Structure formats: structure tokens, C-alpha cells
Ligand binder design. Sequence first.
Ligand SMILES: *[C@@H]1O[C@H](CO)[C@@H](O[C@@H]2O[C@H](CO)[C@@H](O[C@@H]3O[C@H](CO)[C@@H](O)[C@H](O[C@H]4O[C@H](CO)[C@@H](O)[C@H](O)[C@@H]4O)[C@@H]3O)[C@H](O)[C@H]2NC(C)=O)[C@H](O)[C@H]1NC(C)=O
Ligand SMILES: C=CC1=C(C)/C(=C/c2[nH]c(/C=C3N=C(/C=C4\NC(=O)C(C)=C4C=C)C(C)=C\3CCC(=O)O)c(CCC(=O)O)c2C)NC1=O
Ligand SMILES: *[C@@H]1O[C@H](CO)[C@@H](O[C@@H]2O[C@H](CO)[C@@H](O)[C@H](O)[C@H]2NC(C)=O)[C@H](O)[C@H]1NC(C)=O
Ligand SMILES: *[C@@H]1O[C@H](CO)[C@@H](O[C@@H]2O[C@H](CO)[C@@H](O)[C@H](O)[C@H]2NC(C)=O)[C@H](O)[C@H]1NC(C)=O
Ligand SMILES: *[C@@H]1O[C@H](CO)[C@@H](O[C@@H]2O[C@H](CO)[C@@H](O)[C@H](O)[C@H]2NC(C)=O)[C@H](O)[C@H]1NC(C)=O
Ligand SMILES: *[C@@H]1O[C@H](CO)[C@@H](O)[C@H](O)[C@H]1NC(C)=O
Ligand SMILES: *[C@@H]1O[C@H](CO)[C@@H](O)[C@H](O)[C@H]1NC(C)=O
Ligand SMILES: *[C@@H]1O[C@H](CO)[C@@H](O)[C@H](O)[C@H]1NC(C)=O
Ligand SMILES: *[C@@H]1O[C@H](CO)[C@@H](O)[C@H](O)[C@H]1NC(C)=O
Ligand SMILES: *[C@@H]1O[C@H](CO)[C@@H](O)[C@H](O)[C@H]1NC(C)=O
Ligand SMILES: *[C@@H]1O[C@H](CO)[C@@H](O)[C@H](O)[C@H]1NC(C)=O
Ligand SMILES: *[C@@H]1O[C@H](CO)[C@@H](O)[C@H](O)[C@H]1NC(C)=O
Ligand SMILES: *[C@@H]1O[C@H](CO)[C@@H](O)[C@H](O)[C@H]1NC(C)=O
Lengths: 48, 48, 467, 144, 48
Amino acid sequence: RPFERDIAHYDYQVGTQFKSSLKNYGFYSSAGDSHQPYRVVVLSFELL
Amino acid sequence: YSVLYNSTSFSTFQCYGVSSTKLNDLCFTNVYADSFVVRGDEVRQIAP
Amino acid sequence: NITYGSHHLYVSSRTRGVYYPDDAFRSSTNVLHEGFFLPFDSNVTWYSFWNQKYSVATSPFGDGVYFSTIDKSNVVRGWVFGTTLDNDTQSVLLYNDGTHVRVEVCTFHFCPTPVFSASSPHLYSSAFNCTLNYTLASVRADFTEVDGSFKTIREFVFKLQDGSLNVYYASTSYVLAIGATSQLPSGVTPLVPLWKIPIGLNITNFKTLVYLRSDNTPLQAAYVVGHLKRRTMMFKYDENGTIVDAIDCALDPLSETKCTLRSFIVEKGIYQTSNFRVQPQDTVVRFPNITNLCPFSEVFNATTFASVYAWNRKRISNCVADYSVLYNSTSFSTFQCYGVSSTKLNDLCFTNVYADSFVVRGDEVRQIAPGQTGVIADYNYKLPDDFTGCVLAWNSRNQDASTSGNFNYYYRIWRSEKLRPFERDIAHYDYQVGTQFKSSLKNYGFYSSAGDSHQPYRVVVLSFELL
Amino acid sequence: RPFERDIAHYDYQVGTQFKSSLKNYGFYSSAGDSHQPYRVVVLSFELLNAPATVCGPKQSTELIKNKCVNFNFNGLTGTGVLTDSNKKFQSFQQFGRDVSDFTDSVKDPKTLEVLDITPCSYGGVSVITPGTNASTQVAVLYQD
Amino acid sequence: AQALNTLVKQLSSNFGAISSVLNDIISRLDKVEAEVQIDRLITGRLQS
Ligand SMILES: *[C@@H]1O[C@H](CO)[C@@H](O[C@@H]2O[C@H](CO)[C@@H](O[C@@H]3O[C@H](CO)[C@@H](O)[C@H](O[C@H]4O[C@H](CO)[C@@H](O)[C@H](O)[C@@H]4O)[C@@H]3O)[C@H](O)[C@H]2NC(C)=O)[C@H](O)[C@H]1NC(C)=O
Ligand SMILES: C=CC1=C(C)/C(=C/c2[nH]c(/C=C3N=C(/C=C4\NC(=O)C(C)=C4C=C)C(C)=C\3CCC(=O)O)c(CCC(=O)O)c2C)NC1=O
Ligand SMILES: *[C@@H]1O[C@H](CO)[C@@H](O[C@@H]2O[C@H](CO)[C@@H](O)[C@H](O)[C@H]2NC(C)=O)[C@H](O)[C@H]1NC(C)=O
Ligand SMILES: *[C@@H]1O[C@H](CO)[C@@H](O[C@@H]2O[C@H](CO)[C@@H](O)[C@H](O)[C@H]2NC(C)=O)[C@H](O)[C@H]1NC(C)=O
Ligand SMILES: *[C@@H]1O[C@H](CO)[C@@H](O[C@@H]2O[C@H](CO)[C@@H](O)[C@H](O)[C@H]2NC(C)=O)[C@H](O)[C@H]1NC(C)=O
Ligand SMILES: *[C@@H]1O[C@H](CO)[C@@H](O)[C@H](O)[C@H]1NC(C)=O
Ligand SMILES: *[C@@H]1O[C@H](CO)[C@@H](O)[C@H](O)[C@H]1NC(C)=O
Ligand SMILES: *[C@@H]1O[C@H](CO)[C@@H](O)[C@H](O)[C@H]1NC(C)=O
Ligand SMILES: *[C@@H]1O[C@H](CO)[C@@H](O)[C@H](O)[C@H]1NC(C)=O
Ligand SMILES: *[C@@H]1O[C@H](CO)[C@@H](O)[C@H](O)[C@H]1NC(C)=O
Ligand SMILES: *[C@@H]1O[C@H](CO)[C@@H](O)[C@H](O)[C@H]1NC(C)=O
Ligand SMILES: *[C@@H]1O[C@H](CO)[C@@H](O)[C@H](O)[C@H]1NC(C)=O
Ligand SMILES: *[C@@H]1O[C@H](CO)[C@@H](O)[C@H](O)[C@H]1NC(C)=O
């Protein structure tokens, strides 16, 4: 759901094996811009 | 946001519900900031 | 091969060629449909195969064709669609082999006068680079000759939309004598949508395929070819969903009266009618006779570009703007037009054209747009909100980047106020950062070994006027 | 033209010389992302009154009839009352429409039966009041 | 009196815009984005 955060650690079934649902980012310095790490800052505003 | 110009070069500045050129004349009642790191090709997914 | 002569007639189409224009199940409604239809009581060419006369010719396709065959022994086997029907172009081969209906988009070296010899096919000598081969339906149609009179009429409408060949089909029982007058049946027989074949081709001509006997003599048959035109029609839908009546609104004043209302029955009276009779048939293009091409090599292939704070404006006039010239040399990573469509640029004439050229970073190309916020938009180059023109950018690392690094490009980091649209500030001054004074102009470091967000990009902004 | 493919080999005149109209991509592994090769897959969809061939991974639910419920048949959503139908409808087509483009009938994908769709509270309801500051009792007229 | 009061009360309708207040639309968006919402409000109020 929007603005929902799930930090629980659990595994899921891929066929018959169980693999972790968290995957790792490999950020090498010699790579393309589509694989370069990007820092994203999201601002939310209210005007009440 | 003009303070950050000499240090941070923004590859993405997209505003929703407000215009980015109008940000210097608006006062907000509530502001949240969400920070994370994604891949370069996943920046397009941070949008409604 | 087939040295026999031909025999073509000229009959009236009457009230044939009606097909379903959509897929919805409608009922008890009179619906106006606009599109490509066979006009009522129009010229249609009749080609006869009885009396041993071979009448196959390469008819033009146009905006769709109406095909109707009248036979008794399944003489017409299929069709060949294409442009030149040679081996330099790709052609569609839609036919029946006696057990299936096969479509083969394929590059054929067609035999002269392609025809079947009984069940043996003798269409093409060779085929290659052949992007479609599958069967549409499993129907049986033998090559045995049936004696007597003509029994059924099979009607077709072939249309091209979105690179797909749409086939509409209807079969009706129609008894016609061998020596009788060649004429089409009466009434309305709607053609149901049969197939959508993704041929992905350009079709301008089509040829019919028939089958002969083992002695290579034509059988008794006849086929009619009509051409669809841009027409407005009204169809009457039955309560069961079928089409039972049709009106061509451009035929006569009575049909125009029926089309002005939404009824097939008009009461006694005088009715004002909307214009359905006349449609434009020709296009008169009149452009000024200037022949010079615009100096795109002078601006796009310049040795050095201006900096973004000191962007260069150039006036373009008395020339033809052909952007397809730049395709073999310049690869545009950004072609965004405002106020006009980029696909419409080849059909437009501009009273005034300006060209603004500068160099920014790779990630600052997004700031060259109306209503943007950033260092370039605030302090270097701002577009108006009602901007009419196109923004052109392309990566230039073979020109404006080096291994040691290019440092000849500058941008303004600070101003006392945001720039107005199309305003340029080239004054040199310093500003206070805390207690120290630093220059308001910062230097671009364009190394050849860097990411595309830091690679130098050459931006050309065109401004148009339509007065 | 849209969705048109031209695979013919031919040459064109560049000034006075003739050059091939096909140009070659050079995809080096050490290059920027603007010159890196990209694989593009373009999907084309159609939403007609035809049987579903490709659909999404959404789990089905048991039928509820004679009740005002939300429904989802072959991606066609809506809200109404489902009832058993005596309608006979043409094959290789799914839902029935109206002159006002209101979906009144739909073929079930699993049981292969047509069901009516009746809008919830389609009849007129009138309330008769002696008036606030006179009473709180009301009388209800269910029209027709 | 009821017709005049209804005409007054119809000024609080969005008519498909982001807000029924013209000042919020003007102060939150730039000219191009605010033109659409102001045109929607103008069409609704002209209809009223
Ligand atoms: C077109 O040219 C005109 C004339 O040159 C120019 O007007 C100038 O605008 C600046 C920026 O608004 C004005 O400077 C401001 O003036 C007052 C007091 O002097 C204050 O509002 C500002 O001081 C703040 O900002 C300073 C840094 O900018 C800080 O050091 C200070 O502590 C304050 O925070 C600021 O100095 C300037 O007075 C006018 N000049 C004249 C002659 O009117 C205008 O901006 C140009 N328009 C463009 C480029 O669109
Ligand atoms: C080549 C085009 C071609 C088309 C478009 C075609 C369509 C077509 N042919 C059919 C039957 C038939 N139509 C034909 C024959 C023909 N029908 C024709 O339009 C033509 C040109 C022939 C002859 C080559 C015959 C003999 C049958 C009966 C086949 C059967 O028993 O299934 C049917 C009805 C199927 C049914 O009722 O189950 C369709 C839809 N068949 C074709 O062969
Ligand atoms: C990525 O996910 C897919 C889909 O779950 C995995 O494909 C399955 O792999 C298992 C074995 O691991 C097979 O038994 C299944 O038949 C596969 N399903 C499909 C739909 O292909 C795939 O293995 C995963 N890849 C990883 C984890 O590297
Ligand atoms: C970039 O600009 C910011 C904003 O002006 C500078 O930050 C100021 O730096 C001065 C000098 O050190 C300090 O006195 C101020 O307190 C700082 N202000 C803020 C808000 O941080 C920053 O130094 C500049 N960076 C450069 C020039 O590299
Ligand atoms: C790219 O295309 C342009 C435009 O057709 C070519 O420019 C022409 O080049 C020929 C010689 O090859 C000259 O005679 C013409 O006068 C040029 N025309 C224009 C309009 O400039 C250009 O050579 C092509 N570049 C290639 C193939 O590398
Ligand atoms: C089409 O048929 C009509 C019928 O009257 C005829 O007059 C006309 O000449 C025909 N057109 C051609 C091109 O044969
Ligand atoms: C293509 O057709 C030409 C005649 O136009 C012929 O000479 C040539 O052999 C053909 N090439 C093939 C079939 O590869
Ligand atoms: C002549 O027609 C026969 C069968 O009708 C076919 O096999 C042959 O290829 C044709 N001749 C040429 C030169 O294509
Ligand atoms: C077309 O055929 C020729 C000759 O066989 C071949 O060289 C070429 O690669 C083919 N092109 C395609 C697109 O299949
Ligand atoms: C199309 O497919 C059929 C069936 O596999 C094959 O016999 C025929 O040669 C193919 N036609 C071509 C490649 O032109
Ligand atoms: C509609 O179809 C039914 C069922 O086949 C048939 O009895 C009826 O006559 C048809 N109605 C019309 C008007 O053709
Ligand atoms: C760019 O165009 C100029 C025009 O004078 C030409 O000399 C040059 O070769 C072109 N190419 C490059 C890579 O500079
Ligand atoms: C599955 O679909 C078939 C028709 O394809 C239908 O007969 C059947 O009832 C459906 N459900 C189950 C549970 O098999």
C-alpha cells in the first residue's frame, strides 16, 4: 500500500527451494549509469 | 533549494500537486522526507 | 504459360459490400458508420472464366478492395498481395491448398501468371526471408469440377489497418445460369469479420489465384473486384444482432434525407439535409519554391559550442528544414517539441526560426523544458511557459570531452534573481559565500571516462513563429 | 506506416554515390548507456467481446447471486445483482449490452452460463412524511 | 432567494479541478498547469 514499509525478514518458495525475499545490490564503481547507485529523497507536502 | 546547487547535482527534480517553480513562494504545514537508495534504472519507479 | 485471352465486363455493384464495422453486439438500432465502404450502384469490374477465358490481372488495392466470386467448383483458390509481386519486395500469399487456408508472408520469386495445376501448386519457384507461415482455418475444398449452373457467391472485403490485413467474409446461395446476364445479387448480405492477419506490409496491388485442369484450361467461374471509398453509411441492426438493411448516404437525395435523420422510413414532408453528397478527392499542396537546405552542418557540427550562461542565438531563414539529413551523422538523444508535433514538422512553414546552442551536463538536459527548476533553468537558460519550438540534444563526447578533461565550458552557479525567459547574463561578478567571495561562474570538467550523467551534451533549442 | 515492416535490401543515392540503406550497430562492451544495446519488447493488447486468451494472475471467487455485489468477469468490472439468465447469446462472445451501453448480461468463464446483471435498487422509492416538528414516523411507497 | 443562494453555493464546486479556490490553483501551480484547472473552473461557473 502507499507509504507502507515492510522490514520483516522471511523466505519464499521458488519452485521447491526456499530463498530469501531480500536481494543484494552490487554497486561497482565501474558500471553503467543504469546500475550506478542513486540516492532518492522524496518530499511530502501538506497545505492545510 | 538553491543552497544545494553548488554541491548536489539533481538528475531528477519532479514535483506532483505543486509546481517546482512555485516552491520558493509556498509555505507548507507539514513536510516529510523519505530517503533510500535504488538502482539507476529504478528511479522511474518512484512516481505515482 | 497461359496464352488464352481475357474478358472483363463493367457491371453495377448494387447493394453489395456491406460488412460489420466493429465487434459490439448491437440490437434494434440504426447506427451511422463512417469509413471505407463500397459505394452503392458504383462501377465494379466483372472478370469471367467460362468460355475458356483467363482473366487474371494485377488490380490496384487502393484503400481496400471488395472481392466477390461466383462459381460452382471452387475455382478461385486465393490471392497474392504486395506492391511489385517480385522478389525485390515481400508479398502475402493467402490461398487454400484443399485442406487448409494458409497465409505466407514471404519473399517470392513468382512464376509468370501464378496458378494451380489441379491440386498441384505452381505459384512460386523459391521463397526466403519469410516472416509468416501458419494456417488460419481447416476447411476442405476439392478441385473436382462441378457441372451445371453457378450455385453460390462468396464475397470478401480486404482492408489494411495498423499493418494488419482484415478479411470479411459472407457466403450466399445464388443461382446464376452460364449464359445469363452477369449481374450481382440484390438485397443486403452483411460480411462478418473473419481474420486479422498481422502481415506488417505495404499493399498497393493484388492478384487473384485460380486453378486450371490438368490440361491447363480454365474452369467456369467469375470474380468481381470493387474499390472501397471514403463513405458514410447507416446500418439497420436486427433484434438478433445481424445487419438487415443499409443506406449509402452519398447516393441520392432520398438517402441523404434518411441519413440526416436516423430512420429508414421517412414520413411525408420537407426535410433540411446535411451535406453528404460531395467529398474532397484531391489535395492541392502549395509551398514556396525555396530549395536551399538549412545550415544544420554549421550549427550542429561546430568545433566549439557556447557555454550555457553565454548561449548563442542564431537566426535561420530562407531555407528548407529537413531533419532527416541529420540521421546518418547525428543521433539525437532528445527530440521534444512544444506547441507543435514533431511528426508535423515536415508539413509546416515557419515565419521566424531561432536556434539557441549551448553545452550542459548529461543530467541537466531535463532542465531545458518549460516550467523546470534547477541551476541551468534558474540562472543560465530559461524557456518561456508558452514555448513554441523543439529542444534537440545529443551526446557529444568525441568533440567536447578529452582524456585529460575539457575545461572550456562554464555555467552560472548563483544570481541575485532568477532569469526571465530567453534572458542572457554574461557579466562577470563574485558573490558572498559566508564571509568569502567566490566567482559566480563554475567550470565543467568533461572527462572522456565518465558516466553519461557527467558526459557533455550539446543542446540546440529551436523557436518557431506561426503568423 | 504504423506496424509496417520493410526488410527489402536496396541502395539510395547520397549525392552522386550509392550507399546501402542499412547501417550497422557497433555494440562495444565499453561504452556509455546511450550507445549500449537495449532489447525492446512491445506488447499490443485488444479488449473486445471475445473469449479471453491472455489474462492476469487474479484468483477467482465463488458466485454470489440475488445480492448486490461487485463483480469482475474477464476484467470487466461492475456492481449489480446477479441472477440466472434464460438469454441465448452468440458464441465466442461474452457480455450483453443495451442501447444505453449498460451491461445487463455476462457469460460466466467457468460454468459457461449467462447471468443477468440488475442494478441495485433500480425501482423508485418515495417516503411520505407528516413532517419534522410533527412526527418521526414515515410511510414508504415502492413504485411499480 | 433560493436560486440566488444556489448560485452562490455553486462556487464551492471543483468541476473536476484540483480545488474550488482560484487562489490555491494560482499559487500552487505555474501558468501552464494552472490554465487547465482555471479553464475547468471557468467552464463550470459559466454553466452555473
Ligand atoms: C534587472 O536588473 C535590475 C537592476 O540591476 C535588478 O534589480 C536588482 O535586483 C537585486 C535582486 O533582487 C536587488 O538586490 C536586493 O536588494 C535588497 C536590498 O538591496 C534586498 O532585497 C536584497 O538583499 C538580500 O540579498 C542579498 C544577496 O542578493 C544579501 O546579501 C542580503 O543580505 C539580503 O538577503 C538584494 O540585495 C537590487 O537592489 C536590484 N537593483 C536595482 C538597481 O534595483 C534585477 O534583479 C534584474 N532582473 C532580472 C535579472 O531578472
Ligand atoms: C481461400 C479463402 C477461404 C476462406 C476465406 C474460407 C472461409 C470459410 N470457408 C468455409 C467453408 C467452405 N468454403 C469452401 C470453399 C471456399 N471458401 C471460399 O471463400 C473459397 C475461396 C473457397 C474455395 C477455395 C468450402 C467447400 C467450404 C466447406 C468446408 C468444410 O466442410 O469445412 C467457412 C465456413 C466454415 C464452417 O461453416 O464451419 C469459412 C469461414 N475458406 C477458404 O477457402
Ligand atoms: C526467478 O523466479 C522464477 C519464477 O518463480 C523462477 O523460475 C522457477 O524456478 C523453479 C526452480 O527454482 C522451477 O521449478 C519453476 O518451474 C520456475 N518457474 C517459472 C515460471 O519459470 C526462477 O528460478 C527464479 N530465478 C532465480 C531465483 O534465480
Ligand atoms: C555552497 O553554498 C552553501 C550555501 O551558501 C555554502 O554553505 C555556507 O558556507 C559558508 C562558508 O563556509 C558558511 O559560513 C555558511 O554557514 C554555510 N551555509 C550553509 C547553509 O551551509 C557552502 O560552503 C558552499 N560550498 C562550496 C562553495 O563549496
Ligand atoms: C549524410 O547525408 C547527407 C545528406 O544526404 C550527405 O551530404 C551529402 O553528401 C554528398 C557527398 O556524399 C554531397 O554531394 C551532398 O551535397 C551532401 N548533401 C547535403 C545536403 O549535405 C552526407 O555525405 C552523408 N554522410 C555520410 C553518408 O557519411
Ligand atoms: C462504370 O459503369 C458505368 C455504368 O453506367 C459506365 O457508364 C462507366 O463508363 C463505367 N466506368 C468505367 C471506367 O468503365
Ligand atoms: C529475382 O528476380 C530476377 C528477375 O527480376 C531474377 O533474374 C533473379 O534470378 C531472381 N533472384 C532470386 C530468385 O534469387
Ligand atoms: C508455367 O506453369 C507451370 C504450371 O502451370 C509452372 O510449373 C511453371 O513454373 C510455369 N512456368 C514458368 C516459366 O514459371
Ligand atoms: C534476405 O535474404 C538475403 C539472401 O538470402 C540475406 O542475405 C539477408 O540476410 C536476408 N534478410 C533478412 C532480413 O532475412
Ligand atoms: C510454410 O510451411 C509449410 C508447412 O511447414 C511448408 O511446407 C512450406 O514450405 C512453408 N512455406 C514457405 C517457407 O514458403
Ligand atoms: C432470431 O433467432 C431466432 C433463433 O434462431 C429465430 O427463431 C428468429 O426468427 C430470429 N429472428 C429474426 C428476426 O430473424
Ligand atoms: C562536422 O562537420 C564539419 C563541417 O565543417 C566537418 O568538417 C567535420 O568533419 C564534421 N565531423 C566532425 C567529427 O567534426
Ligand atoms: C474450467 O473450465 C472448463 C471449460 O474450459 C469448465 O468446464 C470447468 O467447469 C471449469 N472449472 C473447473 C473447476 O474445472
